[PDB]
Design an enzyme around this catalytic site. Structure first.
Site, mmCIF file in Angstrom:
data_model
loop_
_atom_site.group_PDB
_atom_site.id
_atom_site.type_symbol
_atom_site.label_atom_id
_atom_site.label_comp_id
_atom_site.label_asym_id
_atom_site.label_seq_id
_atom_site.Cartn_x
_atom_site.Cartn_y
_atom_site.Cartn_z
ATOM 1 N N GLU A 169 16.691 25.681 25.361
ATOM 2 C CA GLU A 169 17.567 24.715 24.721
ATOM 3 C C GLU A 169 18.644 24.307 25.714
ATOM 4 O O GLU A 169 19.048 25.083 26.584
ATOM 5 C CB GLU A 169 18.196 25.281 23.431
ATOM 6 C CG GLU A 169 18.576 26.718 23.512
ATOM 7 C CD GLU A 169 19.279 27.256 22.248
ATOM 8 O OE1 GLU A 169 18.804 26.989 21.120
ATOM 9 O OE2 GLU A 169 20.294 27.955 22.403
ATOM 10 N N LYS A 178 17.178 21.656 18.310
ATOM 11 C CA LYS A 178 16.913 22.270 19.614
ATOM 12 C C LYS A 178 16.291 23.650 19.461
ATOM 13 O O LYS A 178 15.328 23.993 20.155
ATOM 14 C CB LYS A 178 18.198 22.405 20.446
ATOM 15 C CG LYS A 178 18.820 21.131 20.969
ATOM 16 C CD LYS A 178 20.016 21.461 21.886
ATOM 17 C CE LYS A 178 21.145 22.229 21.169
ATOM 18 N NZ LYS A 178 21.883 21.365 20.177
ATOM 19 N N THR A 179 16.863 24.478 18.589
ATOM 20 C CA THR A 179 16.413 25.862 18.495
ATOM 21 C C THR A 179 15.022 25.944 17.884
ATOM 22 O O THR A 179 14.138 26.628 18.416
ATOM 23 C CB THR A 179 17.413 26.697 17.682
ATOM 24 O OG1 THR A 179 18.680 26.732 18.351
ATOM 25 C CG2 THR A 179 16.900 28.116 17.483
#
Ligand code: WIR
Ligand code: WIR
Lengths: 299, 309
Positions: free
Chosen positions: A156, A115-116
């Protein structure tokens, strides 16, 4: 008709709070905030139009239509207590953060892993294309220039967050759904994706077994990606060269495009593929995709 | 498509009474609409005049170019249009889901609660029509407009059934809860408690700038009211309701009452239906109409012009 005009932040100098206030200011709302000490954070906010109060006293919440608090709803705070007594909504900062997607083209990056990095890669490719998004990593707002100025909000989306099932994104990515009640976890991701409007886009990594499994349940437009032979947006010709990985990306109705990402590891080809789907959907040029991916240095 | 991923919606069985209204709204919204049916009819002809592309019979190709398919309810994989759509990952949705989705494109007013949804929805539509807002409204899964152009206006008023799968996925601008009643379910159990959370989650689908319209006469609505972190106007006969009915005079089948509203002079209205519950249905309507800026005369004339569903 419009029942939020003045938003009051209790603890507005806080790291998750100041960015949200700045975005709400850019959106045209009246914003006020209290904090225990003045700082560069509060001074910047008042120049954007925030009314700043130092200390906590009931009167600081006067005139507010909604209060935003850091997390817990603490009636021991006199500003919060005043709001609660007068039936003024009090919301945690994570909820107001999610709410920001109602005002922007929201791109929510979900999944157990990636996600990051994918959020960062999207921000870098969009910046290379001059789209300068606001993006959210770890509950902090950044810009790629006032926060919220851009059409785009990239964030995110953590499946364990209380706000996860209340996001209203235009585009949602699921990189993978990993065990690291798993069946309840699958339904959570399916419901998340059904928060897309019918004209939105679900971006799905079909290399992931669970994402592939839930794909037929998503009644929203989808673009799939991965190394898989059936992925809509596919990486082939992968040549890992030290710190950079080269690959050719196939995209529906486009010529094959040779790109590279400036980080090793197969998972970063996948993070890049997700980014390419999103950049492609927004009309970003091949040149800007190449520069954003290969110019990238890290999260 | 890019950026906007729905341009053409295809209806399987578009001549059905529950389907044609949705198609007409999507046409008024500017979407391309196609539809199939087993036989041509006055309904398909009307849709074709509004710009729908009509196909008679079912063949896989009818779905070519569609971004979304709408089916009446069940997804029949034996239907060649459905099967073709599914083979290409084209979303296939029941009409209830497409109907819920329309609120995203409109100023949606969702009327929830165990009892009174249909009458309150009808009264709101009557008052919004009297205010010149020309609302489209949904009762029984059927779309209607003030006069006989479905979906032309900004306003969409719809009942929200707690038992519907779309209930927790509506995106209203205004949401009403008339009451939360266990009926023949017992009061202090786990089942009724899940129903309470469902109503709270429904209200939290309002944006922070939306409005929750809450009947505080109802014990359970009153109970959950502190949990609603959204702007709220309460109503009822209760002395502490924001918007209150007083001076109630029940006259055969017609009821007079005076409504107190914050920052307004008391307003005398009447409804042509007996029973205090219809005073409550009217109060909910007045809250919403007041919030919208509708004049006293339109509220009075809208409430007195209504004769029944
Ligand atoms: C930084 N970062 N970024 C990731 N990104 C994605 N990871 C995966 N899966 C992962 C993967 C991929 C290849 C080999 C092993 C594994 C393990 C897991 O299964 N799938 C993806 N789809 N889109 C993006 C993406 C993953 C990671 C970690 C694992 C280094 C934290
Ligand atoms: C047509 N219709 N419309 C209604 N509307 C509202 N009913 C109530 N209460 C209800 C009530 C009222 C009187 C007797 C029994 C009950 C049960 C529940 O308690 N609260 C309300 N708030 N806003 C509107 C409203 C209620 C009814 C029925 C009961 C005739 C179906």
């Amino acid at each position: 008709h419009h029942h939020m005009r003045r938003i009051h932040f209790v603890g507005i100098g806080g790291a998750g709070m100041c960015g949200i206030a700045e975005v709400l200011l850019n959106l045209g709302y009246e914003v006020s905030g209290s904090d225990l000490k003045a700082s560069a954070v509060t001074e910047r906010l008042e120049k954007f139009g925030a009314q700043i109060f130092i200390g906590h006293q009931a009167e600081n919440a006067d005139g507010a239509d909604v209060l935003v608090v850091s997390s817990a709803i603490n009636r021991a705070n006199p500003e919060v207590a005043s709001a609660l007594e007068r039936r003024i909504p009090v919301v945690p900062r994570a909820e107001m953060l999610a709410e920001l997607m109602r005002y922007r083209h929201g791109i929510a990056v979900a999944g157990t892993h990636g996600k990051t990095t994918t959020t960062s890669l999207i921000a870098s490719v969009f910046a290379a294309g001059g789209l300068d998004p606001t993006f959210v990593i770890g509950g902090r707002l950044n810009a790629a220039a006032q926060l919220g100025a851009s059409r785009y909000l990239v964030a995110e989306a953590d499946e364990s967050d209380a706000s996860f099932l209340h996001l209203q994104p235009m585009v949602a990515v699921v990189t993978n759904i990993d065990a690291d009640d798993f069946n309840k976890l699958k339904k959570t991701f399916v419901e998340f994706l059904h928060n897309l409007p019918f004209y939105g886009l679900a971006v799905m990594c079909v290399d992931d077994p669970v994402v592939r499994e839930i794909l037929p349940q998503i009644a929203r437009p989808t673009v799939t990606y991965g190394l898989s032979e059936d992925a809509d947006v596919r990486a082939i010709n992968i040549r890992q060269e030290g710190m950079r990985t080269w690959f050719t990306v196939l995209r529906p109705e486009r010529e094959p495009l040779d790109v590279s990402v400036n980080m090793p590891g197969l998972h970063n080809v996948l993070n890049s593929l997700a980014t390419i789907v999103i950049a492609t959907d927004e009309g970003i040029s091949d040149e800007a995709i190449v520069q954003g991916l290969s110019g990238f240095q890290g999260v």
